[PDB]
Write a protein that binds this ligand. Structure first.
Ligand SMILES: C[N+](C)(C)CCOP(=O)(O)O
Ligand code: MET
Ligand code: NA
Ligand code: NA
Length: 502
């Protein structure tokens, strides 16, 4: 089996996995919609009772399976529990990262295209009216991704966006095709430091933004000022948990696959804790100090929150660059922003394609080159659905990146810490650890976490089940049909692997 060359490289690779578009895009939006500081408490708790324990659990399962030559859940679930249904459940550790990869890499290509155009200096040019400043950039983004005027099921992506998507796929492939230590690690050791530098620079520059309508400091206060009136709102807790899952790459099967390349005897405790901590730092300190403080700086708090609620991409791809355009050297600043976004996205995308690649390599005994090329082919092909079909992206992000990751987290936790046994699991987690997990967490993993997640899933199901059946748009039914197809495909591949074993 292939392994990480150094501990540093491992740390930065896992951190690259975690730290991504979820930090600089999803987080600011989630925190803004949820009332700033009010969102932070549930966010921190969710980080302690969910993110950390699941992170460790996934590192442990990953290394455990990796020792036996298995980097994916279909096999690992079977090692931990002997059943066919364990494999069928394991299929999600493929389906999820694939589905997410499909749209995620596309958004990444967006950030790349914007990076290029902002570098070369082709951007809308604003003239004191907010709408006259934002409109040009809204039109810019819409032209880029081909957004329809009314609500029209069909998207018309510009040739440039398509070509940039191809390029992005090529970059992902060129990194992935060189393997774990040479391709992923070597890139992480660069991209990560570059990312931190750019993020710090942007944070400072933004902090320097002050106008008659507000300041960045106001945004920081808004984000860090506690509000206890929202603690009774379940939605805030649900959003916090979702954000924790997404940002830490939990339930994506990615952490597990990365961990399967850690040597059996190496410590996953301190490495895991370090990766998670790095992610949280990149999220709350960096991600939260850029977009929101700038939006609040120019348009004030109320308007910043309104913009945040307007959409996820509205803040990152429209508002922020429109704000930058009003400052000296704002175009270059925008460029730095989108470049940061790009590296952050790439480091994650490689991570989510790696599970499929690893299933092909381990189970179907394919060479790395072939596995990577086929994974790339599948992702690229399926991506046309997200590119040309309006609302498809949201649907995939929902079923995979939202519900699926939680369901899968609960599933893996239940299999590892219950069926496989709690004591054996604990011993497996602490084994070889440079430091040991606090005893209390044993009771957190076995009782608190699974109960919390189960409750969450119950609420979610209760709310969504009625809504699902009545939905007007055909694009979402097409997307559902297709991703179900992907699930059948993956299940079939698992079947073939199983047969090959015999
Ligand atoms: C999960 N199941 C009970 C339907 C099938 C189990 O089959 P097997 O893994 O015991 O052979
Ligand atoms: C594409 S890997 C899962 C999401 C990633 N952790 C992020 O926040 O961007
Ligand atoms: Na990343
Ligand atoms: Na993250």
């Amino acid at each position: 089996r292939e392994h990480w060359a150094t501990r540093l490289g491992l740390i930065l690779a896992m951190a690259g996995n975690a730290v991504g578009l979820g930090n600089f895009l999803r987080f600011p939006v989630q925190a803004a919609e949820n009332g700033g500081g009010a969102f932070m408490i549930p966010y921190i708790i969710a980080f302690l009772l969910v993110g950390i324990p699941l992170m460790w659990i996934e590192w442990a399962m990953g290394r455990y399976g990796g020792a036996q030559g298995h980097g994916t859940t279909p096999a690992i679930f079977y090692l931990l529990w002997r059943n066919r249904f364990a494999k069928i459940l394991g299929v999600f550790g493929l389906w999820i990262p694939l589905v997410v990869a499909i749209y995620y890499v596309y958004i990444e290509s967006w950030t790349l295209g914007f990076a290029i155009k902002f570098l070369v200096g082709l951007v809308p040019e604003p003239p004191t009216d907010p709408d006259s400043i934002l409109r040009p950039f809204k039109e810019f983004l819409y032209s880029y991704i081909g957004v329809p005027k009314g609500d029209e099921p069909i998207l018309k992506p510009s040739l440039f966006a398509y070509i940039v998507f191809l390029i992005t796929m090529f970059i992902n492939v060129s990194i992935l095709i060189r393997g774990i230590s040479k391709g992923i690690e070597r890139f992480a050791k660069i991209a990560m430091p570059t990312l931190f530098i750019l993020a710090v620079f942007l944070v400072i520059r933004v902090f320097l933004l002050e106008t008659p309508n507000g300041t960045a400091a106001d945004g920081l206060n808004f984000l860090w000022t506690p509000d206890f009136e929202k603690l009774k709102d379940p939605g805030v807790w649900i959003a916090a948990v979702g954000q924790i899952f997404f940002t830490l790459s939990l339930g994506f099967g990615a952490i597990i696959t990365y961990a399967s390349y850690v040597r059996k005897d190496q410590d996953i405790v301190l490495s895991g804790l370090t990766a998670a901590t790095l992610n949280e730092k990149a999220e709350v300190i960096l991600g939260g100090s850029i977009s929101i403080p700038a939006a609040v700086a120019f348009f004030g708090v109320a308007n910043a929150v309104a913009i945040a609620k307007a959409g996820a991409f509205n803040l990152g791809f429209i508002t922020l660059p429109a704000i930058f355009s009003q400052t000296a050297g704002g175009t270059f600043l925008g460029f730095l922003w989108f470049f940061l976004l790009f590296f952050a996205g790439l480091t994650s995308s490689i991570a989510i394609m790696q599970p499929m690649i690893a299933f092909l390599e381990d189970e179907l005994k394919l060479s790395r080159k072939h596995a990577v090329l086929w994974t790339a082919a599948i992702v690229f092909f399926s991506a046309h659905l997200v590119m040309f079909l309006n609302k498809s992206l949201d649907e995939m992000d929902f079923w995979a990146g939202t519900i699926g990751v939680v369901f899968f987290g609960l599933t893996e936790l239940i299999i590892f810490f219950w069926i496989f046994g709690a004591d054996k699991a604990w011993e497996e987690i602490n084994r070889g650890g440079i430091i040991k997990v606090p005893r209390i967490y044993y009771y957190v993993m076995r009782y608190i976490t699974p109960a919390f997640l189960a409750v969450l899933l119950v609420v979610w199901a209760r709310e969504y089940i009625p809504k699902i059946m009545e939905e007007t748009h055909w694009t979402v039914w097409i997307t559902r049909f297709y991703i179900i197809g992907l699930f059948l495909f993956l299940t079939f591949l698992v079947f073939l692997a199983e047969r090959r074993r015999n």
